[PDB]
Amino acid sequence: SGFRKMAFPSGKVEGCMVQVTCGTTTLNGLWLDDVVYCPRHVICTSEDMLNPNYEDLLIRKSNHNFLVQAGNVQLRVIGHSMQNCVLKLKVDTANPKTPKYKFVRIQPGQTFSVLACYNGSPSGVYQCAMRPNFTIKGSFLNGSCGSVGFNIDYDCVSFCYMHHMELPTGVHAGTDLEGNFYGPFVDRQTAQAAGTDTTITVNVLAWLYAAVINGDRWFLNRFTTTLNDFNLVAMKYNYEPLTQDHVDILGPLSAQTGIAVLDMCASLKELLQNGMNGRTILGSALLEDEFTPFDVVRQC
Amino acid sequence: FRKMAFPSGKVEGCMVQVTCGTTTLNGLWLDDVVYCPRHVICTSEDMLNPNYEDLLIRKSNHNFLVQAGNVQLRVIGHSMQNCVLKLKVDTANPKTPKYKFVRIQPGQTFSVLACYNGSPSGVYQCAMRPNFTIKGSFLNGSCGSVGFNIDYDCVSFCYMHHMELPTGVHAGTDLEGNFYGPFVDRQTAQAAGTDTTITVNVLAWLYAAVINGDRWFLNRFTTTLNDFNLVAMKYNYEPLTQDHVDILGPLSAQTGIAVLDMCASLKELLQNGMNGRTILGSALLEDEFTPFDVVRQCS
The missing domain is CATH 1.10.1840.10 (main proteinase (3clpro) structure, domain 3)
Structure with a gap:
């Protein structure tokens, strides 16, 4: 007998995690080729989060406002743009540890591994499923925003999730890597209600x-x-x-x-x-x- | 609150494949030594009452095929330390992390990188049971898989998979080849004692x-x-x-x-x-x- 819930080996993903800092907020980013992906609410103070005007906030930012740090090497931001709820930070150097990769959007019931990160340092890896109410039940402390979810093919890493928000009920909500939320959630600090969770x-x-x-x-x-x-x-x-x-x-x-x-x-x-x-x-x-x-x- | 395993990147690049004759299993490649279970030198017909010290005297360096992905590793020497073979190879592993061999006590936890033919396929967190086995998920070919803990920059290797008991549980040694629990590396009737709750x-x-x-x-x-x-x-x-x-x-x-x-x-x-x-x-x-x-x- 025995059937352990196994997570994928995280090696290939660990060399892609970096630290993004804007003003006083710091969260995790994903460094692939010459692009760093991170959640757009990195440009918010805690007071902007009730009713953020993302277009207002982003036009006022300069390339030098974004500190990106891959361990001890500090990258240089050469430009930026916003795709839905994710921010794309173009940098001067490509990541040489870029695995073969893909972007996929998953449906509820599907499983994937999560590499939990803090300030650009991987701290642990676990296996989970997308719940039917489009939430995930995992252990995300403050600072894990930007941790990503993935599956691994023969050699190909499929990125499917990026963590954005913690709901008051204790669960976690996020987007695919094109920045479209899973489920009806929004990157505001308003009262959001996860639907009924059900068994798959x-x-x-x-x-x-x-x-x-x-x-x-x-x-x-x-x-x-x-x-x-x-x-x-x-x-x-x-x-x-x-x-x-x-x-x-x-x-x-x-x-x-x-x-x-x-x-x-x-x-x-x-x-x-x-x-x-x-x-x-x-x-x-x-x-x-x-x-x-x-x-x-x-x-x- | 989920059960989280340590990140495995630092261990992934140390796994290799070790073949001797017909048996193939996993090995741990650190500096210029490969570690693997000694029963790799045994045929299925040899596991009944193996004379490891006699069986190892017959073998030569060219009986061991060691593969690190597509590259091949040349064995220049071999030795035995209780229940693990030490294969000296010709090139040092440039991915060697800062590491340490420690022995743990029942009740303690660690992450396992489950492998097959030198290729990592999964990771999970478990505890050493008070009866000295682990409720793991190893199939045929995962012998030699390793358990570890990560101190800040330092990987502590504490387990190596050797055997599957006929109940679902798995038994192993430390990296110095001393068994956890009252088991031997022979194909025979072996029973894990009464498990208790930690x-x-x-x-x-x-x-x-x-x-x-x-x-x-x-x-x-x-x-x-x-x-x-x-x-x-x-x-x-x-x-x-x-x-x-x-x-x-x-x-x-x-x-x-x-x-x-x-x-x-x-x-x-x-x-x-x-x-x-x-x-x-x-x-x-x-x-x-x-x-x-x-x-x-x-x-």
Whole structure:
């Protein structure tokens, strides 16, 4: 048994983190080629944050107002522009540690690693999923704004997230690397409400398939259900509704095993009504929903 | 409040692949020496009662293929230090960090860089269990994977993966080749003892809940060092020493709750359970955060 939530090795990302300072605010930036990306609210004092006029604030700034520091080497800002909610700082030197990279926008349910940074120093790495209410549940202290999220292909780093804000509920909101927020959030200090967080049903189903592959079976039942009956019940437990798209994605898993998808849904419905009754599933005492189908049918 | 692993960049560039015959596994390339488990010199038919000292006398330098990515490393010498092979190579690793070999004690935490055929594929944080194994995620080919801690600029290497026990747990040595726990590097029936819950790490995690404003398990009572151990022992909870109370000091000052007061809360959590409640979003009590981890991640 055993199924550890593993994060990607962070090496390639660590040599791209830098420190950006404007006036008195300092946060983290991302140095790729000859561009440094960082959140635009770096140009705000705490008093501008209630109703920032980003265009007003940026026209009044000069290249020499931005201190960029890659360890002990201080870069020179040669120009700048603003793309949505991210600020792009062109510098005179390219980063020689630039990996092969890509920008992707993810959808809720997907997972990625986060390299938590403070003042341009990496401090830790963890693995997480984008929640259905477009928030992330991680450990970001003051100064982590600008930490980034990524996945790693064969050699290619896919950057998908950059941390902007902490919500009063304790969770964290951010943009893709083109500066478009995930979810309905804005870079203001106004009262923002995260929606209801729900369990990622398709993610739970892929994990339970990995359990039958790894020997566990005590939770299977002889029943089957329809997609509509299941969603009527899952909704009752704050579970995300399942779509045909989700069913097709699980296909190969239900091919390696004998169990049709709507079978596993009937089992999952029984687990919700009864609980665990002390037992575990792949050494876990809770239903895990932060392992995608792709992850499961790749590292069987 | 998530379980965070150290950044792995400084370790990534020290992993290599070591082949001898048909066996392939991971090695740790520091200065001009490669470290790897000694059973790399064993065939699957040789692991029944291996004579390592005899098996190593047959072998020569040219029986070891050492790959650092696309480059090849030439072995100029070999030696054995308890349970690890030391392969002397011809070129020094220019990515060698400032490093140190330390041995840790059960209950302590560290990050593991899980590898396959010399290639890092994942990182995660774990604790050395009181029965001397780790609940890890290693498949075939991850032998030789390393565990580490990062002091400010200095990497402390404290673990090297050797074996997988038939229960899901994994066993290993320090970098000087001394095993953690009562295991040997033979394919035979080996049993990991009774695992217990690291009580001092649970307490530090309750302090961390209190820092994050979750303070519902707090009560007016307190208990004694001797009364609590009586309840702890009954529930499979390692006894609490006076040193443990001294380490929890800085967290008792930040929060105002004394170790034996907080111990009265934990006592109540074990007897009556959680009454359908969560601490930090959990129905179970986490025991893989040390006190230092909580100071690191919080204050």
